[PDB]
């Protein structure tokens, strides 16, 4: 339960390795969480960075209410899904500036993601809190500092 | 929407073993997204086996609204908006049906009704 530097480093290592995630948004009509799969990396300061189709369901939800959840799992893990390490973030979405360096970092890390680069937009998901599940035993509660550096 | 689209949703539903669960953080209202074991019940309705003490199980006790994602971007997947209601072999774990209101099916999207997925 008690957060250690080891727990902090696993959380940071998951974010550095992340190419995709499950994104939680609030359905405007009903306020029920909409859970969709997204391309997700970090930018320079290690803050989660999403690439969304600007008029898709999850992008429209964000436009109306920027409250956002992320699940980040180890994509390479083998065996039972429930023993994979995974990080839950509670955050707020913010449209991310134009940047030549950003649109390039992203391709070096995800080549496939040329198809997307149009109507496609970067969002920073600024963390408030985090839940680390290491694959076994009890989770760690994380602050925003715990996840970033 | 079409029969092959309804058939794809139930296909993903049938022999799904885990999912991303979306519940509402009670303090902040932010969607909390965690991984869960998920099966269908007798009648094809999503069924989650959830630890009573875990953040998500707490969250559903306060407000039973629940999202599910069942499946990286070329993978067929299914988002479900629904409401949770209570229903190896450790005691504190419990069963929930996530009762579908609507759905979003991504093959390559398609809006779906509760009965399109059952």
Numbering used by the authors:
A (entry chain A): 7 to 123, 126 to 157
B (entry chain C): 9 to 79, 87 to 102, 123 to 143, 147 to 156
What's the paper's own text on this?
Within the opp operon is a gene (pden_1323) annotated by the National Center for Biotechnology Information (NCBI) as a pyridoxamine 5′-phosphate (PMP) oxidase-related FMN-binding protein. PMP oxidases belong to the same superfamily as HugZ-like HOs, which motivated investigation of Pden_1323 as a HO. Activity assays of Pden_1323 with the hemopeptide substrate microperoxidase-11 (MP-11) show c-type heme degradation to free iron, CO, and a peptide-linked β- and/or δ-biliverdin.
The X-ray crystal structure of Pden_1323 was solved and found to form a dimeric split β-barrel similar to HugZ. However, comparison of the active sites of Pden_1323 and HugZ shows stark differences. Furthermore, the C-terminal loop that contains the coordinating heme ligand is not found in the Pden_1323 structure. Taken together, the lack of the N-terminal domain and C-terminal loop indicates that the presumed active site of Pden_1323 is only partially formed, which provides a rationale for Pden_1323's lack of HO activity with free heme. Given these structural characteristics, combined with the fact that pden_1323 is found within a gene cluster that is likely involved in the transport of both heme and peptides, it was reasoned that the substrate of Pden_1323 may instead be a c-type hemopeptide. The inability of Pden_1323 to cleave full-length cytochrome c shows that the peptide linkage must be small enough so that the porphyrin macrocycle is not buried and is able to access the active site, while the cleavage of hemin at high imidazole concentration indicates that the histidine lower axial ligand (rather than the c-type thioether linkages or the peptide sequence) is the crucial factor enabling catalysis. This suggests that Pden_1323 may bind a range of hemopeptide substrates in a way that creates a HugZ-like active site, with the histidine residue provided by the peptide substrate coordinating and activating the heme iron. The structural comparison of HugZ and Pden_1323 suggests that the change in substrate specificity from free heme b to a c-type hemopeptide involves the loss of the C-terminal loop containing the coordinating heme ligand and an opening of the active site to accommodate the larger substrate via loss of the N-terminal α/β domain.
